Each structure stands twice: as C-alpha cells, then as structure tokens.
Amino acid sequence: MCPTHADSLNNLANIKREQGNIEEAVRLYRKALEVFPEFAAAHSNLASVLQQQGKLQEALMHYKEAIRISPTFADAYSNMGNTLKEMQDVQGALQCYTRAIQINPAFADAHSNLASIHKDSGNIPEAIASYRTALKLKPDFPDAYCNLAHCLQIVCDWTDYDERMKKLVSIVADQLEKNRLPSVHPHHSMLYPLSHGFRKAIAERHGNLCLDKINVLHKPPYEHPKDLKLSDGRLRVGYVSSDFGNHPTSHLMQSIPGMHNPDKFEVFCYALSPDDGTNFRVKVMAEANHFIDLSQIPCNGKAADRIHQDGIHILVNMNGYTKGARNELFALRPAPIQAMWLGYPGTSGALFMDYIITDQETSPAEVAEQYSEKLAYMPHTFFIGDHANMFPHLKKKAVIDFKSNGHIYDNRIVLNGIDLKAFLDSLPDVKIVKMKALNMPVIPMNTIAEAVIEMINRGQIQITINGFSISNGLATTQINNKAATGEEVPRTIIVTTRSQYGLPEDAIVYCNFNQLYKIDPSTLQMWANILKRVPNSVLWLLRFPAVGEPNIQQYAQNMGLPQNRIIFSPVAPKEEHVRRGQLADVCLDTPLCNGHTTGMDVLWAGTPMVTMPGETLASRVAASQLTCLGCLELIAKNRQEYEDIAVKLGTDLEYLKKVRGKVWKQRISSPLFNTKQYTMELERLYLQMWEHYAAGNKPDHMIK
C-alpha cells in the first residue's frame, strides 16, 4: 500500500485509455485503487470509462468515492451528473451540475452540461444562456460550441451564420484528425455544410460507441439461418422502433405490418418503448404476427438473444441516431441481413448495417459514397404515409361561396367529412364544379352558409344543420381528442377557414409547416424574392418553436418585407395540421432539409409543393415524393428555378388551378399514399436481399 505506486498506474492507464484500449485502462485504474484506495483521480477516471462501457451503476459508485475523498472536485460532480442523466435521474443530474457550479463558478463543463439538460427539456433560451456562459469561461470548447450551434439553428438565430458554419466544419475536421468523438451529432450533420465524407465519418464514430458498450458483454457471433425451412418458407422480418406509438414513424407505417403477406412473410415488431396507450401501438400490436416489448429487456445482450431466438432473417433499423435507438442490438448482429429504413434520413456509417432502403431519386448512384450501407432501391419512393387510413375525411372537400358575385375559391372556406355527401344532399342548392370522377361541391351563400360562418366568427365549438354535426376545425380536441391526434377518423363534419388562422381571403398563401431549424438564411432570401414578385402573397409558418418567430421577422424586415407578409400559427394536433394545409395555395419546401412527414402531410391536402433537391438524403425526399406523385414541374434544378416556379404558381391562377388539380387527383391515383402497393414492393425487395444472401453473397447494391 503506497501513494506513488498507485500514482504511476493511473498515468499508464490514462495512456492505454488515450490510445483507445478501454479494457486495459480499467485493469490499471483498479490496481491503482488496490495500492492507494483514497485516490480521487483514479476513482474518477475508472468511473469515466465504466460510463463509456455502459456500467452506469458501478461508475456512479466510484464518482461518489472521488467526491467523498476530494469535495472540491467539480469535475467528478459534473461527470456523476452525466451518469445520473443517462440513468434517467435528470433530477439528480441537475443537482450534480448545480453543485459543481457553486463550488467552482469558473468551471465551464458543468455550465455546458446544465445547458444540455435544458436543451433536452425543450428550454432552448435557458440552454443558449448556459452554453454562452460555458464559452465565456472556456472559449475552445467544441461540445458547448456545437450544441449552442444546434440551439441557434432551432430558433433561427443566424448571427454570424457563415462564420459559424465555417467553424463547425473546422471543429469536425480537427476532431476526425485527432481521433476524438466529433461534437457534431450525426442527425445534425445534415444541416451544416460538411463534406459527405465527414458526415459518414461522424456517423461511423457514433456507431463505434455501440461497439464499446457490447464488447463488455463478450458475446460470440450468432449462427444465422441459411434457409427458410424452420419458418415454413416464410421470411422473418424484424421491425425495431422506439416509435410504435404516437410518433411520426407510426403515422407513416402503422398499416404496413398488417399488410404483409402471411404466405411468404412472418412479421416481428420489436418495440424499444413502453405502451403509450395510443391506438398506433394497439394497431401494430394487433396486426404484426408477433409483438415483443424490448423496453422490458433493458440488457442489449438478452434483447439481441431474443431477436436471434425468434429466427429473424432481416432486421430493420427504424431509428438510426434518434432518441430511443438501441443500435447496440444491431451491433450484436443477431440477424444475417440488417437494413436502415424510413425513420433516420442518413447513414449509420456502421459496419453492422448491410443495406439502406431508399430509391433512385433520393439516393442516386452518383452520391452513393455518402452511405456506408449498400443502396436497396424501392421502385418509386422509399417514403410512405398512412394518410389514406388516418385521414380519409380529406379524400373529398366542399367549399362555401361567400364572395357570391366574385370567385369560387377551393381554399378559403372548406368542409370535410365522412358524411359530407349526405349533408350536401340535404341542402337545396349545391353547384358542383367539374375539375377539367372529381368535382368540388359549392354551397352558395344561403342562410345555412351564414350559420356556418356565424359559428366560425363567434368561435362556437359546433352547430347542428338538418341533424348533421358541424364542427369548428379549431375545436377538434374538445369534440374528440382521439380524432385530433389521428387515432380516430373524425365522426363529424369539420369547417376549416383562412379567417381562423388570420390568412388573407384575397391572397396567395405560401406555406411551410416544418420545424424552423430546416430554414437557413438562403432559404428565407429565396422566399423573400418570391413574396416581392407576388404582391399581397403571404408566407405561412409555425411557432415551431415560438421563440423562432421574432428572429425570422427580424431577418425578413432587413430583407425589406413588412411584418404582415409572414403569418405565424401555433403548432396544432395532427388532424388540424394536415386539414388546414387545404387553406394554402402552394407549399415552399426547405432545401436545407426537406419536409419528410411534413411533405406527405401537405400533398395529402392537395397542396402543390415546390422543392430544390440537394445532395444529402434529407434534402432529396420531397423531390422523390413529387416524382412518385407525378409532378416533375415542382422540382427546381437551382434557386432561380425554384423562385420562378413559385412566382408562376402565385401569378398565373389558371396554371395554379391545373397543378392543384394534378396533386389532388394524383395523391389517390399515384403510388405515393398506397400502403398495400408499398408493402408489396418492400416484399419484392426483401426477397432480393435474401436470395442474394442464400446464394452465399456478401451484400451489394440492389438497383433492379
């Protein structure tokens, strides 16, 4: 028992640890502590690498020791905090970060970690404040800088945007050289002008964090099936998601498990989340051949084992680097074929993923170098939505003519309803506007139209007309919470109007209902150019989040736009959100990162969407959606072409009518919203993947 004996072991181990051999670092640190038990720095370092190994309970014990031994050890409080955060004790993490800060007001990391808790909780201003404090205290601090950058992206603070982008690139480049974990998150990397090489490298380094956490389990390779004989000629497909519940992913693909053909497929849904009580979870549970709640099996070893016992041929990763992911499951390779699908719009960058399911428009061969996976092409778009099932009440609209001697508009006052035809047939006088199968009933301004308008204007919940229930589209939540979320189809007729959202009755409405983080200065310039060329037009955006609004309005004033040219509405429930798209004339897609779910949402309302596909997967989805829809005239080769298409749609009301009618027809007539066709194509593709493997081949691009 000696202090400088133990001191030497600690330095040998920071060495092994620096190299990257985590496993030896531990054995050294542990000998250091047998030699000198009261060695604060050893306890703290052992704890740090136990945390990396995902042995949180044990890490936490050693942090506690470090603190007992050295009570001024701010650093150990800060990392104990992080351990508690990963353990879901955000309460206890918070106490750690705050205690660090009281003991050493000048200690930057605790300020940064306090900011991350705020950021995770949606408190973006509180996060910005604490990241700024960390950077005053320690101006070279990449973690703090890159998280502040994402906070600023979220609220559309573009102060020193180009200089900031230049510095994020600079930090990633330095961190990839110096072999550290990059401070830019792979999901965020799509937003910054990094190289395809850098984005893939960022992904790959996040993938390797899974390898550290599964190497501690010391499991051997699994024996994979070589044939379909034990599964009766059925291919066993395992869908793995944290999002079988009320989450966009489920709003896209909840119908698909149920649409698989039982003669050739056996469907396993592996949920990483507990049952949130919603119908989305009910449906996947009810319709999958097998539903396994892996939230009840927190050990990645035992969960991977469970996948392997079920005999899965193709395991499908629906999370990539999103909240709730357990990529450890995939790193353990319990299945012989492992595919990225739908939920993550980027590469895993990881050796443990074989294919990415995409399409020729989204992921053309010229840009294959950005993916670590082999391309597996679906015939049209990889994108899909459940809109035909969730929102069939929007398959048909009717309007009210209130101008009377004026225009018959398709989007100022709109009725939708499963029982709309019956309500219309009860009315005396209904003009039917043919659409040069399809037609738009027009309620003229009788006293019934006045009663509907009265309801909208007095802000009443609902009225009754000839026994039919007529709902104010702002009150869906009070009438039927389940209809509001998309869990139920509304059983009332819903009225939606521009007057509800403060949209001008006599103007072109350009919408974008994405989260504001997808907007960059260039995009708002493009939009300003369009608005300047189409007088009285407005841009319709969401408080997504609200603190973004003042920032965008400021950048818009500096571009010479009066305040009233951009109209902000609150985020709404799913069904109001999709329905009120019917009020727009055109949707202006964000080129930096496209609307994904949001794209399918505007197209379901028959709202034409203008996009400029970039190079990233995330920047090409809207074009892929539109080529499948069959509207190639809405895809721009550059900013000039985008502005021109938008301006044409706003100035040439005959062209607008034609293109809106195209989208309105083709949402039904094209493959885009056809879940049965989608599922059958996904099945054709699964079988290619499998035949290729059965013939004894390593994975290769599937383009035919």
Partner: peptide
C-alpha cells in the same frame, strides 16, 4: 376558439 378576423 375565435378566428383572427370576421368573414
């Protein structure tokens, strides 16, 4: 549930 303006 008021509208921003009157039709």
């Amino acid at each position: 549930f008021m509208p921003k303006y009157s039709i």
